[PDB]
Write a protein that binds this ligand. Structure first.
Ligand SMILES: CCCCCCCCCCCCCCCCCC(=O)OC[C@H](COP(=O)([O-])OCC(O)COP(=O)([O-])OC[C@@H](COC(=O)CCCCCCCCCCCCCCCCC)OC(=O)CCCCCCCCCCCCCCCCC)OC(=O)CCCCCCCCCCCCCCCCC
Ligand SMILES: CCCCCCCCCCCCCCCCCC(=O)OC[C@H](COP(=O)([O-])OCC[N+](C)(C)C)OC(=O)CCCCCCCCCCCCCCCCC
Ligand SMILES: CCCCCCCCCCCCCCCCCC(=O)OC[C@H](COP(=O)([O-])OCC[N+](C)(C)C)OC(=O)CCCCCCCCCCCCCCCCC
Ligand code: SF4
Ligand code: SF4
Ligand code: SF4
Lengths: 357, 155, 70, 318, 176, 88, 96, 55
């Protein structure tokens, strides 16, 4: 009848340390915010900082952002769909396309140098350039990933066990959903007609084309189908941006926000100072505040970054997409079986890095 | 000889335990996902003992993956005592090793050593999935160099 | 590959083989190259005691035929 | 004489039960695209030994809330039941030719539920107690269909003698005559044996371990092996019931080869079926059983009683 | 642009109901699920045979800090301490002192392995490419202390690898 | 005897290998009661195989099918008046 | 190496039976690959050290160590700085 | 790749798809790991004239 999803068990005072560090040192916090769609968090932070800075990223960086933003989009619903099935108790459909994650996970090693916490998308562009030949490897992976999702849908969608256990479970009305602060798959699955990229076009997402797979009823199953259709839509966005790669630089041509090139590092004095100061205190962000918010592959991810005007943030309250999503556990589990509670969690794909800061 | 007999028994017990650990997952943060790729076919661990039996009672080694919080402190601890011996804990990642990126924070205890006796430490943030397989393997060889029945014979 | 499960399967077939041959061969050894005469009804039972008592060695399996009578 | 046959039956059964852990982790993996236990032992031939040895050398925990008297009888009540259930199996000439063998197999199959019931009471934990309570209620609900399927099948066979199975099923597999009841029977086996989509207790996360929630290495060997033990046999019972082989009196070797291969293949499907389906929710178990499985089984028993009368096809009990 | 998902309509005709009734009675989508897994059984595995087989990486891999040395022999770190200022976890502890020759040299360079995060910021900090993250990940330990690295261990790590990391930055400094 | 010997040996083997593992180291009621009544009604038609060979099997046909429709009738009344749709 | 095999498995090794005094026959570990072959084995490049020797330098280790932990060759943290607060070293002989 | 013909048709039939056309393991389509020197471009404002920070 009544549900209380107690949290804090992972809680870290993320923005408490954010105040003491500067913007560049603050960036790894965001990668560790959502440990499923990491670079999407990097996208939100970089957009917020360069929104205050009144500096736009170069077009080459922007088209990188959607390519990796959709790569993270590929990650999360694999994380979301498969473990939701693992929440139900499905093992093998989880693992099969789990392996395909090591493909673009290996791509992440090719670009950032790490695997999970890339620290790649930074305020003012993207840190490093794409390694030679990697775009072809992305095409190699993309050309075959459509097959594995046919394997997922065949294994899960059609089977009567998956439906009768998960359909008509945890329904939520459109007005109740939106007024509860829900976002993303919570809204689109439950009839609500809204998506961040289509409505509020940030970065180059307007140029690319895709579809928004909204649902009719809005139960766990409908949300599950909404996730797997966004996966197909993610492949479409990958196809267009990968063929839309421009000739351009990876970071803004402003050494006060972007580190000068290592060749220029050891050649010219201005570059030496600019990297020196950028790596001592960072950059001077003009005061003010903003709520630059973009859709995470889980929901709406935003940050309330208010800057005093120094080289360090004053206060950065991070919108947790699951913060409101976990609040709905009371009713989506109300009037439902005990086993539906984990089904609610699975279809919500509650990730304990954001709901717990 | 008597020492040979206690040596053969020591090898038989040690070889069984090292080769068939049944770890119980205690992932709390991004350190959980990368170990959870060891479950993915790329770095299969079920190839050697470590399997899905889970059931913290039926567990030999505990892998503490992710940041440890003060409110998480007692509930994790009471799991460790309820875990029957031989119990060993694996410290996953910079956060569980010594607090890592949140060392100077109020809601995290610096390291799992303050809570449980850590037998092995795997650095990384997060450690690469295969690097833990090495950490499990080096823990496996750590069990190989154990002289339980030998030390009893001296007594 | 896939045949790496075959040696795991084959050893099972060896294990389950033992009951099949044993309870058959033990039957052959305890019946003298025959099978244990089943007795699902009274007739099948006192038939054995008829054969067991006439054999003289008090074994039902040993049977005396035309060479016995005149 | 007799005793040497007793070990020659139960001992190979027991050693096969230990090994079944390997394939559970291996053939699932080879379907899960994993590798399965391979490093320890050549081709993973020694992993079950490693599995079993620590369970008999790890510390046996007795929770203070557990009655030690109840804590020890239940694992014996389970494993022993599985082994003595093997004695009427018609391996060429069965070890025990009980003319009521079909009832004999079913009777102690109902005795199995006392193993979980007492363990759930012995453990004496809130979550543990309800987990066993809504586990026993599943098994008992599946025995009524179990009995009805049996009753229909041997009605066309004849008496309840398990040896008569190989006589009735001479020319054609009995499945060709009761295939609507065969899958009716097969799913029923999937539920009593506590395997997905009815894993329920032993589910690694369904009830974490269900009957093994607080029940760890030591006495837990006789409580995670017994469920796997019933798996080989209840499939083998299906092998005798619907997939009967031929038995030449001068060469019982053929039926040993055929039956063992048939029951081993069925167990592969049993291990195949865990790695392809989710877990039924509790209400779905009864909804599937009482309202779809139960009425259909009754109708099929309606059909299979009249059909011998319809075609003058009553079987000889003797 | 948008698209529904669950807007399929079930046909009520004799044909359509027959397939659905056949599907319910004769489980076919369940068998379809069985066929999917069985086809994967005969699919070759992708299990890397550790340690003999090792997973792929890239020349940009970050881990296991190690100070380098100039071709002459003198170590690279001039104690410019940009790595200390940048280090978002403050795992670096550097104390400088004027060496007897006259040029700087760090008398104390401890990077706490279990405070560091391997973000790769430190190599980007020092303009002399003094500290880099090597390709090692095989330094798991059993005591918390040996994770606490110092200047001596860092130099020993640098001298140990050097050659491997010498080519790594040669094939990556163009990107940087 | 043989039956007693078989069960006795099984208990000792279970007992022996247990010892080495110990010293060497309303809805809930309704499903129960409904099963009980169905199970008791099931025991009525267990003697069916031999009963199928009675010399007046016509009377057997009317009455063996009788119990089976009552099995359906008991479930049918249970189903329509909630019943198998257990309290939730 | 096996280019016909799929990626990852396409290069593999078996280790020495005698590695620096301690046997490696049932003591398999990943930490015996030297710096030269740390690249080719990991598919970090296609240039085996036999066909591409690493840049020879004096300070490079002439013998690649394994994970020295567990052995008496472990590492112990210790201050590498010098004490900067010296005492007064009170002089001796007389009395006030 | 790998596998033999009769196995392929077995998994082709059981999955109802042609898996040999595209698989989930990389064999030879992978780009060569060692690559030529990546000559990177320059900034849009990289010019010796009329590029004061006043603009
Ligand atoms: C059950 C079915 C019959 C037995 C197995 C038949 C079999 O494996 O056929 C080869 C092969 C194995 O599967 P595959 O996916 O085609 O193999 C792909 C590569 O060729 C596989 O490439 P590969 O590099 O693995 O090829 C070499 C491989 C070749 O291995 C074989 O040919 C298996 C038999 C070895 C003896 O041998 C080894 O790797 C050596 C180690 C062998 C391990 C232990 C094998 C035990 C087999 C059963 C023993 C008795 C139980 O199957 C077929 O050619 C057709 C299917 C089987 C038809 C059987 C007859 C009807
Ligand atoms: C002259 C002819 C005389 C005889 C004619 C008899 C009628 C015609 C034949 C009818 C079909 C056969 C009998 C019924 C079978 C289905 C029973 C049933 O309840 O189905 C619906 C049920 C329930 O479906 P449901 O729940 O979606 O819908 C039921 C209807 N409502 C919603 C109203 C309740 O389906 C199942 O039980 C699915 C399977 C569950 C178990 C999971 C594992 C399945 C594994 C399948 C592959 C392996 C098969 C192995 C077979 C045996 C091998 C030895
Ligand atoms: C060497 C090993 C050889 C055997 C390998 C396994 C064979 C069995 C599993 C795979 C079967 C084929 C898979 C397939 O195409 O599935 C999808 C197909 C189609 O699935 P579907 O859900 O698309 O159904 C389409 C047809 N309508 C719409 C009318 C329902 O499966 C079948 O056609 C199954 C037919 C037989 C089902 C029998 C179930 C009852 C069995 C009772 C006991 C006998
Ligand atoms: S060590 Fe790194 S990856 Fe692991 S929990 Fe801490 S921040 Fe996350
Ligand atoms: S990688 Fe990052 S956290 Fe680690 S020492 Fe370098 S700058 Fe500090
Ligand atoms: S940033 Fe580089 S040069 Fe500066 S102190 Fe650190 S290691 Fe030395």
């Amino acid at each position: 009848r009544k549900c209380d999803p107690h949290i804090g068990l992972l809680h870290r005072g993320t923005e408490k340390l954010i105040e003491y560090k500067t913007y560049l040192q603050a960036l790894p916090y965001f990668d560790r915010l959502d440990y499923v769609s990491m670079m999407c968090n990097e996208q939100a932070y970089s957009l917020a900082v360069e929104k205050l800075l009144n500096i736009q990223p170069p077009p080459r960086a922007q088209w990188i952002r959607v390519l990796f933003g959709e790569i993270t989009r590929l990650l999360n619903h694999i994380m979301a769909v498969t473990t939701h099935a693992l929440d139900i108790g499905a093992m093998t459909p989880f693992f099969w396309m789990f392996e395909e994650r090591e493909k673009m996970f290996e791509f992440y090693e090719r670009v950032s140098g790490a695997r999970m916490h890339a620290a790649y998308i930074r305020p003012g562009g993207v840190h490093q350039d794409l390694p030679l030949g990697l775009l072809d490897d992305i095409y190699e992976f993309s050309k075959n990933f459509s097959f594995r999702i046919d394997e997922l849908e065949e294994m899960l969608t059609n089977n009567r066990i998956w439906r009768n256990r998960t359909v008509d479970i945890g329904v939520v009305t459109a007005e109740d959903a939106l007024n509860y602060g829900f976002s993303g798959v919570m809204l689109r699955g439950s009839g609500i007609q809204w998506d961040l990229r289509k409505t509020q076009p940030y970065d180059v997402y307007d140029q690319v084309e895709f579809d928004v797979p909204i649902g009719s009823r809005g139960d766990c199953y409908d949300r599950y189908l909404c996730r797997v259709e966004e996966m197909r839509q993610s492949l479409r966005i990958i196809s267009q941006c990968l063929n839309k790669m421009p000739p351009g630089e990876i970071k803004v041509d402003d050494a006060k926000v972007s580190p000068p090139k290592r060749a220029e590092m050891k050649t010219s004095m201005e570059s030496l100072i600019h990297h020196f100061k950028l790596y001592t205190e960072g950059y001077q962000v003009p005061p003010g505040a903003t709520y630059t918010a973009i859709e995470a592959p889980k929901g709406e991810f935003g940050v309330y970054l208010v800057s005093d005007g120094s080289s360090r943030p004053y206060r950065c309250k991070i919108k947790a997409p699951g913060f409101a999503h976990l609040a709905g556990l009371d009713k989506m589990s109300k009037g439902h079986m005990l086993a539906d509670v984990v089904a609610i969690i699975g279809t919500q794909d509650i990730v304990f890095g954001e709901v717990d800061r | 000889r008597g020492e040979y007999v206690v040596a053969k028994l020591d090898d038989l017990v040690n070889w069984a335990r090292r080769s068939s650990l049944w770890p119980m997952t205690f992932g709390l943060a991004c350190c959980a996902v990368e170990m959870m790729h060891m479950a993915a076919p790329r770095y299969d661990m079920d190839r050697f003992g470590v399997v899905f039996r889970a059931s913290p009672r039926q567990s030999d080694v505990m892998i503490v993956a992710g940041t440890l919080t003060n409110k998480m402190a007692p509930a994790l601890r009471k799991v460790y005592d309820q875990m029957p011996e031989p119990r060993y804990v694996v410290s996953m990642g910079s956060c569980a090793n010594g607090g890592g990126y949140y060392h100077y924070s109020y809601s995290v205890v610096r390291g799992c050593d303050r809570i449980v006796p850590v037998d092995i430490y795997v650095p990384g943030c997060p450690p690469t999935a295969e690097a833990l397989l090495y950490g499990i393997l080096q823990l496996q060889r750590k069990i190989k160099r154990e002289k339980r029945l030998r030390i009893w014979y001296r007594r | 590959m896939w045949f790496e499960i075959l040696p795991g399967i084959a050893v099972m077939a060896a294990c389950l083989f033992i009951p099949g041959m044993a309870t058959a061969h033990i039957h052959k050894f305890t019946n003298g190259g025959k099978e244990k005469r089943v007795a699902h009804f009274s007739y099948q039972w006192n038939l054995m005691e008829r054969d067991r008592c006439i054999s003289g060695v008090n074994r039902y399996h040993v049977t005396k035929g035309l060479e016995n009578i005149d | 004489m007799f005793m040497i046959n007793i070990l020659s039956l139960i001992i190979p059964i027991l050693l096969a039960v230990a090994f079944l852990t390997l394939v559970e982790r291996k053939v699932l993996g080879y379907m899960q695209l994993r590798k399965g236990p391979n490093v320890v032992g050549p081709y993973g031939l020694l992993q079950p030994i490693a599995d079993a040895l620590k369970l008999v050398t790890k510390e046996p925990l007795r929770p203070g809330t557990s009655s030690i008297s109840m804590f020890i009888i239940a694992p014996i009540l389970g494993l022993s039941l599985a082994l003595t259930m093997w004695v009427p199996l018609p391996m060429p000439y069965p070890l025990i030719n009980m003319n009521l063998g079909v009832l004999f197999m079913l009777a102690m199959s109902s005795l199995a539920v006392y193993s979980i019931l007492w363990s759930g009471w012995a453990s004496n934990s809130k979550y543990a107690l309800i987990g066993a309570l809504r586990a026993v209620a599943q098994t008992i609900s599946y025995e009524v269909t179990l009995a009805i399927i049996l009753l229909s099948v041997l009605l066309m066979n004849g008496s309840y003698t398990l040896s008569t199975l190989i006589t009735t099923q001479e020319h054609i597999w009995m499945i060709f005559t009761s295939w609507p009841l065969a899958m009716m029977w097969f799913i029923s086996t999937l539920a009593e044996t506590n395997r997905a989509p009815f894993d329920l207790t032993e589910g690694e996360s369904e009830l974490v371990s269900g009957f093994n929630v607080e029940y760890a290495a030591g006495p837990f060997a006789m409580f995670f092996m017994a469920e796997y033990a019933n798996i080989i046999m209840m499939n083998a019972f299906t092998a005798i019931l619907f997939l009967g082989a031929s038995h030449d009196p001068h060469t019982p070797e053929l039926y040993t080869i055929n039956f063992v291969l048939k029951t081993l293949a069925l167990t592969i499907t049993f291990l195949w079926i865990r790695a392809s389906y989710p877990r039924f929710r509790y209400d779905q178990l009864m909804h599937l059983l009482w309202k779809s499985f139960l009425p259909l089984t009754l109708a099929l028993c309606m059909w299979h009683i009249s059909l011998p009368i319809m075609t003058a096809s009553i079987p000889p009990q003797s | 642009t948008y698209k529904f998902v669950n807007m399929r309509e079930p046909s009520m005709d004799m044909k359509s109901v027959t397939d659905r009734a056949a599907q319910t009675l004769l489980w076919t989508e369940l068998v379809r699920g069985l066929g999917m897994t069985l086809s994967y059984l005969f699919r070759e595995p992708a299990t890397i045979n550790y340690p003999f087989e090792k997973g792929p990486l890239s020349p940009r891999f970050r881990g296991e800090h190690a100070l380098r040395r100039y071709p002459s022999g003198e170590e690279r770190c001039i104690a410019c301490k940009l790595c200390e200022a940048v280090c978002p976890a403050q795992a670096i502890t550097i104390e400088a002192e004027p060496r007897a020759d006259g040029s700087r040299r760090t008398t104390r360079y401890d990077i706490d392995m279990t405070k560091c995060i391997y973000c790769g910021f430190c190599q980007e900090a020092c303009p002399v490419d003094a500290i880099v993250e090597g390709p090692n990940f095989e330094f798991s330990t059993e005591t918390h202390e040996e994770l606490l690295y110092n200047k001596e261990k860092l130099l020993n790590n640098g001298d140990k690898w050097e050659a491997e990391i010498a080519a790594n930055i040669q094939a990556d400094y163009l990107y940087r | 005897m043989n039956i007693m010997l078989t069960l006795l040996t099984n208990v000792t083997l279970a007992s022996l290998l247990v010892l080495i593992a110990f010293w060497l180291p309303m809805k809930f009621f309704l499903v129960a009661i409904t099963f009980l009544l169905f199970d008791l009604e099931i025991a009525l038609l267990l003697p069916l195989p031999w009963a199928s060979q009675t010399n007046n099997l016509k009377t057997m046909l009317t009455m063996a099918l009788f119990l089976l429709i009552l099995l359906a009738a008991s479930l049918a009344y249970e189903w329509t008046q909630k019943g198998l749709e257990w309290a939730e | 190496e096996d280019n016909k095999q799929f990626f990852g498995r396409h290069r593999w090794v078996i280790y020495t039976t005698e590695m620096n005094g301690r046997d490696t026959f049932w003591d398999v570990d990943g930490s015996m690959v030297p710096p030269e072959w740390h690249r080719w084995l990991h598919c970090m490049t296609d240039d085996p050290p036999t066909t591409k020797p690493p840049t020879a330098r004096k300070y490079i280790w002439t013998n690649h160590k394994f994970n020295v932990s567990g052995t008496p060759q472990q590492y112990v943290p210790y201050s590498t700085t010098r004490k900067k607060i010296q005492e007064w070293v009170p002089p001796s002989t007389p009395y006030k | 790749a790998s596998a033999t013909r009769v196995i392929q048709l077995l998994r082709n039939w059981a999955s109802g798809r042609d898996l040999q056309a595209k698989l989930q393991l990389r064999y030879q389509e992978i780009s060569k790991r060692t690559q030529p020197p990546p000559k990177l471009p320059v900034g849009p404002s990289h010019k010796l004239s009329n590029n004061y920070y006043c603009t």
